[PDB]
Amino acid sequence: MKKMAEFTFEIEEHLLTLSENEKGWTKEINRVSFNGAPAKFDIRAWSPDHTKMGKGITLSNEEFQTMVDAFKGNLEHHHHHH
């Protein structure tokens, strides 16, 4: 019992543009809203004007923050962090 049960996705906020790979395969990080304003962090490769599809994965804020803190102290080791 819902009025028109269909999902609408749109790019809410542009976070990071990683790189465009292969042939028209753009891969970036932004927040996509699905019906309303539940814009979560979506890390996905987007298909070109022709065919194929990206293996992009969606993360919630909790999950997203988790990886960020880890990599914050781990991968970026060029600054002062023991």
Place this chain on the structure above:
Amino acid sequence: MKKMAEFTFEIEEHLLTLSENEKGWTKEINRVSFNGAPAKFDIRAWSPDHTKMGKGITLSNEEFQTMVDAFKGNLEHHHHHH
């Protein structure tokens, strides 16, 4: 000759588990070694028994390094600044 149609995948480095969703849907980030030497970053969701499609997106070293720098410099702001 060797039948080069078998890309041997082995996870030599488990970065961190993000969250375990529902009950069997584990979502984490790890490095998968394809053939052996090329072990790059992969963000994949794993399913319970039988296992089903959980997306799973592979990122290259450069693209991964990119996001870590940016996310290290931000995002960590508490969702109640104003």
